[PDB]
Amino acid sequence: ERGWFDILDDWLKRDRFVFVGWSGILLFPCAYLALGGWLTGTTFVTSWYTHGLASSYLEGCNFLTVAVSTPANSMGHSLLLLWGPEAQGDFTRWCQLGGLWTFIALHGAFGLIGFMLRQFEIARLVGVRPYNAIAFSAPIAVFVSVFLIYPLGQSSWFFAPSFGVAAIFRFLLFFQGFHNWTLNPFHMMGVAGVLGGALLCAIHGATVENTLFQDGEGASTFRAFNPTQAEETYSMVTANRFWSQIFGIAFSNKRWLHFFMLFVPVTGLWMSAIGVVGLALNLRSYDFISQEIRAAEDPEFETFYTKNLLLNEGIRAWMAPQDQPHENFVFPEEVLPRGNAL
Amino acid sequence: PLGISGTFNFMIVFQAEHNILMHPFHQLGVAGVFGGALFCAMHGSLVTSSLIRETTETESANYGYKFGQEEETYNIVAAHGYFGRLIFQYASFNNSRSLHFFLAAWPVVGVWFAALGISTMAFNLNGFNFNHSVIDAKGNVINTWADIINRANLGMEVMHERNAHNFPLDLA
Amino acid sequence: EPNPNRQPVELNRTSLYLGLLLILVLALLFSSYFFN
Amino acid sequence: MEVNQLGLIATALFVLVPSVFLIILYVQTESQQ
């Protein structure tokens, strides 16, 4: 049977400059629209009606302060479809109401699905194991937990991260002040996975480059390599002895080493995603109850834990009125927490 | 401080006083460690994806490598053939030496910039300040996300070391 | 009537060290939150 | 300090049960030929 399905399959999988595949039908429109929506919004669209913020090059923002901001809190978790009951097909109103935010987040989610299907698809055609796709599950877990699950647990999309550099920084500081997220052991594991991943990256790269075999005469050692050579280009034995004597332990199995490099950052991102799922419900690691009971009763007891809560209290009170305009917080000067003089 | 919550205290007060999130060297540092972890899982996944079959399904594939063996344990051509098609051919390495150099250089250079951000904010050359940068026709301040960051920073500033300041400016 | 599907199981010494280090570090991390 | 007193047995079983599992598997690997 060589019907139309098999002929389409032929054309989709042609060896061209940009491989397409069946996955490309999902991947390419969704990725392109998510990116086009972000450039369109950051260049032309305001956040005046949803946040009280300017947020585009058109309004005078720069690369650090432009964003596609989340919709107004009054939108709830509305899909905000262009043809839905809020914008009612009006493209201009849709932009002013935050429709570009759900547009980017939803086309982005489906684009990420498409990229992982592409990793599977290409891997199956070339005949390699699909561990690159398996590793990409960690970015997907992060995107889904931070941009979808977290606001879905909260009151509305408004509290999701906005798509911009400074808007994401506000998101980091909100998470310190309100959730005490640095204290969360699931974030801690994520940090260990990210910094340990950076470390493994640097040390393995540096180790290969400094246990190279002399396979050429030039002072530039890059040329002395051939992609089809059967020999290892560097000495695992010398590398193993160096680290055993510098650090005490060393890799001896090159296959374990490279699996470990997959494992560490991927597991770290997965752990951080679990903690954010908890923050969706405000299920924080905010306090140590034992510390609070002692400190309530003993005004001489002070730790770095109690010092940081005072900072969190400052963040909440000073940023909430501007950051949550729909709440209409009026905090007179006399109620604002402040230290002496400042 | 030499402790876990003391680290967080240092980071929070640093943001209040130098706006480190808005300094390009901390931003390069983040690119360094986010990129380092990306390339770490990247290299890990490609090499693991192209391990030459040397074992049965009931044993660990790790036994297919023997310490000190002369021959490579994976097929870099197959790895290049997969990753070149994932992006495009010329976005993929086929020289292992320059691949491993890029793995070395990217996080190391990024962390150099991160350390230089801390070292130069030690002398109070702080992150970008766009507080009240956008002004309307009458002169009303139009807030941006930078101004929301400033509100959070003010809260950290006014509470930190709450008994330690007698005069209005926290100059060091 | 011996079942043909049985297979010996292995844990090498480096895996034991790795496993014990993971468990002890996880305990050292989570213990503070267990005591609260 | 008023800590949760279940924290003790929770930590102890957290270390012991998986550590013991690993030791059983390792020792019976050594004893194979």
């Binding site: - | 000190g68 063996q69 | 280090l21 | 924290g7």
Partner: peptide
């Protein structure tokens, strides 16, 4: 109780370092 627990776990890790360095499986070339 909680202080003893923290130090005990820590002390086990330092002991584990010792065995992992000095009583490792030797790497053997082939």
């Amino acid at each position: 109780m909680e202080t003893i627990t923290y130090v005990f776990i820590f002390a086990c890790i330092i002991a584990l370092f010792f065995f992992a360095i000095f009583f490792r499986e030797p790497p053997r070339i082939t």
